[PDB]
């Protein structure tokens, strides 16, 4: 049968680099003037919110960028995906993932991945498309999950990214400057840190089993 899901799994060095950059982002963001102002939109609670604790559910080991969730063949289009020539040829193969930004929402915290044309060939085209993936180029959903809220599923991270990229589609001024780049407030608890320099992480395309 098929793996739980295919994707690019970052090396140990790469994962810790991206992970630590994610922690710094949550710490810096939670301290920023603009975020403390929009706490009412980020949280309908009830005085500083520690975002690193908020996104308490983090990936236990190495970070990864998902391509296609298969659930051992139980997912729609799973069989059709794994039997592609490029998928079979790319299995166990080395890739560099380009991180363009870090983003935060009331549900998830993650990193936007800008896939190359070679890597876009590995992105699935199953018919059941998220409606937020429309008007945007394919592979826009590509991401690395950094953290989730208690009752949130990691699948949500992609949905949040697509929802964010619909807003940007463009935009106005940045509301602040962080050491790595410009910070944008997209409203409704949504934040995007556009990196001045895009991070490059090495990863291996393969299949993960439970
Ligand atoms: Cl790690
Ligand atoms: Cl997409």
Author numbering: 164 to 209, 213 to 335, 338 to 378
Paper text:
2′,3′-cyclic nucleotide 3′-phosphodiesterase (CNPase) comprises 4% of total myelin protein in the central nervous system (CNS), being the most abundant CNS non-compact myelin protein4. CNPase consists of an N-terminal polynucleotide kinase-like domain10, a catalytic phosphodiesterase domain11, and a membrane-anchored C-terminal tail, which contains a cysteine residue that undergoes isoprenylation. The catalytic domain enables the rapid hydrolysis of nucleoside 2′,3′-cyclic phosphates to nucleoside 2′-phosphates.
In addition to the catalytic His mutants, near-complete catalytic inactivation is evident also in T232A, T311A, F235A, F235L, and Y168A. While recognizing the caveat that the high KM for these mutants makes kcat rather inaccurate, this implies that the π-π stacking between Phe235 and the nucleotide base is not only required for substrate affinity, but it also may define correct substrate docking into a productive binding mode.
